[PDB]
Every structure is written in C-alpha cells, then in structure tokens.
Known about the structure:
By secondary structure, the first copy, chain A, is mainly alpha-helical. In chain A, α1 (12-21) packs antiparallel against α2, α3 (39-56) packs antiparallel against α4 and α3 runs antiparallel to α5 (71-85). In chain A, 69% of the residues lie in helices and 0% in strands.
Amino acid sequence: NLPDMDRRCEHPWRDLFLWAILQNRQEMANYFWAMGPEAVAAALVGCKIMKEMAHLATEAESARSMKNAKYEQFAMDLFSECYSNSEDRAYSLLV
Amino acid sequence: NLPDMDRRCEHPWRDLFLWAILQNRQEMANYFWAMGPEAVAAALVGCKIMKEMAHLATEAESARSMKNAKYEQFAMDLFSECYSNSEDRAYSLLV
C-alpha cells in the first residue's frame, strides 16, 4: 500500500515538518514550518505531537524541551498577524 | 602521628580548598574547587563549613559574606549539568 518510492512527495514541507517534529528536532521543525504552505494548522499539529511525546519521554531534559515547544505560540502569533491584516479572511482561515 | 613533611599531599586540591575555606577566602576556594577531582562533595563541604563559621564570626561583614557563600549553588548547578548529561551516571554520583 506504500506509495511509489520514485514519486515526488505531494507535500514535501509537510512531510519534513512531521519527520522533524516526531524526533524533537525543533530548529528544523521551525524551518520546515516557516517554509510550509499551511502554517497555523502545522503549528497546532506540532503542539499536539509535542505534548503527546512529552508523556512518553524517558529523560527529563527531553521531556522539558517537549513541554516548552512553543508551537502554539507560533500559531497564535501568525493568526494575530492574519487577523490584524484582514479580520475577515482570518475567519475563513479558521473555518 | 602527623605525616611526613617531605611527602606530596595525596589530595592537594582538597587540602588547598579546605585551607582557603577555613579562612573565608572564597575566591581561592572557588579556584581550588574548580581545580578539584570531586567538586559536588567539595561544594557541599564548603557550604557546611561556611554556615558553621557564620555563627562564630565576630564582625558583621565577615558573617554576611559567610552567609552568602553560594557553594550549595555551585553543587546544585554542577549536578544540574551532570543530570542533564546522563541522568543515570548522576544517580551513581549521588550514591
């Protein structure tokens, strides 16, 4: 059921962001988020995955880093910019 | 019962740290601590000796300096570094 190994990924930045988030690589995750098409949803996904992995982390330092992921802050700030710009396209983006 | 005056001290940094701590010379004590083999235990010893001498100090300035010795802070920060590094060798160090 796996796709063709020879095909280009339809959402390459989405895939790279997921791959970097799933292994607590927050700098690359920030870069792939800043290079992605849908950044508010991506930041919310990153927030969810980080708070899900914070429970599974064995080391205290990694768990602390996951608990201080600040991806929800990225979503909030980007939506603040969007809502200041239009305040009507912002609702469409929300829905 | 005193040892040989001609022999090298087995723990020279330990002896210098004790000598500097016992006379409220905190800069040399910090140097000898930073140059010692077992620094968490040495910092805890310095904390103990400083809080013991703070009661015996006659002048208020010296007593204040002893009461602000911040050797326990050195032990805490070094153990924070050690616990962040391994978190398993840290327990062995503790025990």
